[PDB]
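Materials and Methods. Structural model of ATPase associated with various cellular activities, AAA_5. The 181-residue sequence of ATPase associated with various cellular activities, AAA_5 from Staphylothermus marinus was retrieved and submitted for structure prediction as follows.
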Amino acid sequence: GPMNKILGFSKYWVEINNWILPTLDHIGLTLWGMIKKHASEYRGIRYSLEKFGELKIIHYIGSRASHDLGKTFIGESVLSKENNKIVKEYSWPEIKKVLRKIFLDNGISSDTIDQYFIAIRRIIRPSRSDRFFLFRLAEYRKYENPVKYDQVRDIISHITWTGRYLVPIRPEDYEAIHSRG
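The predicted structure was written out as tokens:
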């Protein structure tokens, strides 16, 4: 198997968006983060992708991330090896430039993108040496009824998500959320 620690091993992962954001329009386009902050999560999802070929990602919004969609699962997407043939790692200026291009090509305004990076940078404070991971997602689709946390609180374990960005869930937890809204 792997060697260093992985948070989990699964075809189904949740992306947790817990910080204040100027928009949710970018959600479903990428997964990215600072490696040393999410090392076992990155290692787990990379190893999961290798074994499963394609992962299903459910996107979760924390209460601070939105006033109206707080604590809800809003949609899901696909993380595929075909869209992610070469794993590349990045400095902060490099990944900013890659993400800005992706977000502009998806119709997000330049001003909103400026606000996104200012909000993120407040929180993670990169240094010149810090490295970043990036996965390109595909097929994001918004749930027509947002799945509120209270609908599945006794099924998934939110308490274990504290301070996480990507967490594994079981196949039946995916089906439980997917089958709602």
